[PDB]
A paper describes a structure:
Escherichia coli phage [name] belongs to the genus Kuravirus from the class Caudoviricetes of phages with short non-contractile tails. Here we show that the virion of [name] has a prolate head, containing genome and ejection proteins, and a tail, which is formed of portal, adaptor, nozzle, and tail needle proteins and decorated with long and short fibers. In contrast to other short-tailed phages, the tails of Kuraviruses elongate upon cell attachment. After binding to the host, [name] tail, nozzle proteins, and short fibers re-arrange to form a nozzle that extends the tail.
The dodecamer of [name] adaptor proteins forms the interface between the dodecamer of portal proteins and hexamer of nozzle proteins. Six long tail fibers are attached to the sides of the adaptor complex. The coiled-coiled part of each long tail fiber is held by fiber dock loops from two neighboring adaptor proteins. The hexamer of nozzle proteins, attached to the adaptor, is decorated with six short tail fibers, and its central channel is plugged with a tail needle. In the [name] virion, the Ig-like nozzle domains are organized into an L-shape arrangement. The first two nozzle domains form a blunt tip of the tail, then there is an 82° turn and the remaining two domains point towards the capsid. Nozzle domain 4 interacts with the short tail fiber dock loop from the nozzle protein located counterclockwise. The short tail fiber is attached to a fiber dock loop from a nozzle protein. The fiber dock loop contains tryptophans 839, 847, and 857, the side chains of which are arranged in a pseudo-threefold symmetry. The position of the short tail fiber is additionally stabilized by the interaction of the central domain of the short tail fiber with residues 71–78 of the long tail fiber.
Author numbering:
A (entry chain G): 755 to 1005
B (entry chain G): 856 to 1005
C (entry chain B), D (entry chain A): 3 to 50
E (entry chain G): 303 to 374
F (entry chain G): 2 to 51
G (entry chain G): 2 to 101
H (entry chain H), I (entry chain C): 4 to 67
J (entry chain I), K (entry chain H), L (entry chain C): 4 to 97
The structure:
Amino acid sequence: SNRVKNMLINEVCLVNPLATRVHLHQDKKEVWVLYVGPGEPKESFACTKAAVWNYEFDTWSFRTIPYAQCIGLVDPPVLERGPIWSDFQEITWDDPSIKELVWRKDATNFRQRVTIVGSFLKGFYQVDVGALDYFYDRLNDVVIEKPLEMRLERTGIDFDNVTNEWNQKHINRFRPQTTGSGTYIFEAGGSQFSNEYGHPHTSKTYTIGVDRHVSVRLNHPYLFYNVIDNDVNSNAAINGLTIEFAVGGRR
Amino acid sequence: VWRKDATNFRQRVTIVGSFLKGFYQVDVGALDYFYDRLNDVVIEKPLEMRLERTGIDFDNVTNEWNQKHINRFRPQTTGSGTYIFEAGGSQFSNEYGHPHTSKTYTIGVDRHVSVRLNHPYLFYNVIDNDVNSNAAINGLTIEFAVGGRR
Amino acid sequence: MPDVQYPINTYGWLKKAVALWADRDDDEFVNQIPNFINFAEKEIYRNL
Amino acid sequence: MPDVQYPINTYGWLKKAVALWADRDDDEFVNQIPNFINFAEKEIYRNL
Amino acid sequence: SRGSQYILTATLSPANAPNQNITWTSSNPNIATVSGTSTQGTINALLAGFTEITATTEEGNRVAVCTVRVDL
Amino acid sequence: ALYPIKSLGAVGVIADQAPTDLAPNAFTNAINARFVEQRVFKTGGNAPLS
Amino acid sequence: ALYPIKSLGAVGVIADQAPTDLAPNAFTNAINARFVEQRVFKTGGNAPLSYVDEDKDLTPLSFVSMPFDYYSAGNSFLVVGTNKKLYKLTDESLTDISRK
Amino acid sequence: ETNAVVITDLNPLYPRDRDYIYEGAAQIRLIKQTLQNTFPNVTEPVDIDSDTFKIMSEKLKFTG
Amino acid sequence: ETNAVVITDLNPLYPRDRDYIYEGAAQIRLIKQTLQNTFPNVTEPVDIDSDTFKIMSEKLKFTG
Amino acid sequence: ETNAVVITDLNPLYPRDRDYIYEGAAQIRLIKQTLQNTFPNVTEPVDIDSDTFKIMSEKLKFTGDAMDVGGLMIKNVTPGTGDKDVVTKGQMEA
Amino acid sequence: ETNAVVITDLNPLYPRDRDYIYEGAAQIRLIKQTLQNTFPNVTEPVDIDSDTFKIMSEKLKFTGDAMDVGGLMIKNVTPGTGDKDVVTKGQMEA
Amino acid sequence: ETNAVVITDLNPLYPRDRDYIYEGAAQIRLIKQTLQNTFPNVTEPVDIDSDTFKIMSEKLKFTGDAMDVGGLMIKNVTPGTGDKDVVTKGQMEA
């Protein structure tokens, strides 16, 4: 209604709305609406971005897909449908065109079915797998793989529920309670106003198992924090935060 | 315009069959076409918004009849623009108070509006006559004291 | 709102630094800053 | 990231350090650091 | 001008024509080349020298038109 | 005590009612305004079309 | 007083709304994220996939996972289509079953 | 692996999300090397009767 | 792959990092049977001895 | 399909002129951001002097610098050219 | 635009709600003028090898006493220098 | 519209504010290809140099003699110039 309406209409009404699609990601209780990215040719139908919605908790989120012309569910190849020691009679440790293999990959179904994509890059692609993103480049006409980049962003943290908005607030620490292993890249900033997306002030990496917090120094009244996870070997999580802050003055 | 804000995936626009010999869009950038019978000509001018609330007795905080010195309004706006705040009051509750001052709250520079009143019944108005403004008002926070009565 | 230079050398810049150091600045206020300065200087020279 | 030097020995580095220990980076505040330092030096030397 | 390529359109007399096709021709194509359908997309190579862009309807009457490009 | 004035767009114009007995997030008169549950901003104007 | 920030995943992205009038467990923008009612973590990325080495040079437009077929044994396969032809793959070989 | 932390005190637990099974031979050869290093000269340990082990574990501190 | 059943029987580098993967099971089985036959009497608690933990790895000599 | 995302390296034929109008001020902002990031300090970089790079193309080969035969009689202190004070001091000491 | 703030530090971001696309030529000509002003005398910058840039960015502070890397070699003759060019004089003449 | 591919090739005023708008794409493409071909080696980080940021925009001259002699420290590594101590020891030893 008044959460992502003006965002989806804007992002879909630019290039090609008729290419919008949907898929029931019952494996994890998610129903995303595929659509073409903001910057693409007007003659393209390869959906690039997706707005995923969880019908179990009513939350909206977005992501990127590898230029999906279609989508569907199907069982994986024999090498991923559950292999056997006495099957690799012709395979060796020299990874003959196969490296992305794992002993026990996380499953979302009893029959171990995988969601596959019919990509515009001349081949199939899995949509929900380990951290890796395949971004296409028109300059050299080549496919490029890079770590999956997550970004969280919230602006205008006025602490109105605690103290007055206009009052300046010295920010010192964020004390999160994460789970798993990983290495985040925290960013923070602010602005003396409420309308502007504040400018950054610092950035720190919160590696789990060593650090228990992130130290940032701000005194702008309107804070904003961002979270980034560009690592490939990270499967961490963020349950909640606890910001330490003081109160200065105004005017 | 390069990219105008859209309200639909197919980018459909609401059109009007006007009495001014032509069509007109109803929801577009700040511009209002007011007709004049004197010279029989169409006139375009900025779109004038006006908010108005009277009889702010603060009964939920202090007593109504008590006089209250008004000093500041601390809004929390969004976007860019330039508002024109107006404020006033009256020693009674039935009358639409007379204005006392007026200030412009340009966003990105000012963080508040300074007005000086002590009438017990305050009223504030908001006007936006600018053409290049797309601001917004989420809420206010009035700073006030309490004098006496009678 | 108004600006000012590092040294407050004259009345012209003092009457603006007054409105600066107090966000309570507007038409009905700046016009009386001269009266406030008059009262302050009187209170000063009365015993200084 | 206003960065000052370890041997604070000048006026510019002092100004930057004042703006640092008061993290607010805004023209409304930075442009008056000279006035604050003026008041401070006039408060110290007046009885030192 | 240099490099600029303006698109020309050719609206046939009848609103529709079945099995219709156009093969644009221009003497000395080394100056420019066009083909396809009603959409021409004339390309310019030099900064001077007039040209005679004439249509050649595959079907229909051989009767065509002529246009005089002006690079200056 | 606290005196916040939030959700200026939760409710819009309320006339025909004692203005000294309404909420702070209401208005006795409005024109060319648009509210969505937390906010207020100028309504889109008009323009010709041919 | 207390200032806890819990249930970071109870509600996700809330745009088109005054960011200075939301809850601490909300975000004005997100991408490649996944929330389950108490938590947030990076969404699973992407990766290629090839039943055979012949499909890596194909631009499919649609497909369906047919589970059974008279000729096929108790094993599923795919019915994928392209701009001109319809193909079938069952992890062993590619075949063009386009109507002749 | 991560670094030359190689020592006869191994780290069974893995991230378990991505292991690159082709590296299994590396772990097997590492285990073989560690087992050969801990017991360089050994053919077939027998005759212990699993009785002197207990007396040695209880009668420790062979220092003077 | 060796056909031995005891320790110090196969080069840890024998996999070559090029051998076929179907031999991994035969390597794990070989390792397990070797560990079992080299210490068939280990059934009581771990009974850590570590050879006195300090010096007896070299001073424990009996030649003449 | 959105091609208005480029940094430090652009593509002239990606715009594909026969495209929607959103391509425009977006590309202009991209060009401005790239120019600012590449060199966010510019007052008057005139260190060329009518294409001196052609004759001064010796920057890549810092082994055989021109080293004009001129004596370069501008030196303050170096571990090279020594004074004759050691000659006088040595003669006096022995 | 708003005023003569014109300088070689541009402002990509626009209000984005109304831009009057016919003004695009103004922005293009402004960009052209700024690019011609920042580099008045330039034809084709090449031969840099993108290697001296890093040494210059790390070896900054060219003010009197700088630290630089270059033709560091045996440096025997270097016309106009010492290195066994004045010792031989005292040796022979004596 | 010019048919050149390098800088200082087209008058910023050539659009005239009267030319047709369909040429904007050709102008943006020209600008982008010029920026690409004038600095084809810029792929590493921005590597801001700004010509020393202070004075080198005019003092960096090389016409008939070089200036700005380097102020390097001792070269104990990569033996180059004849450091005073080494030559003195060699001379006194013989």
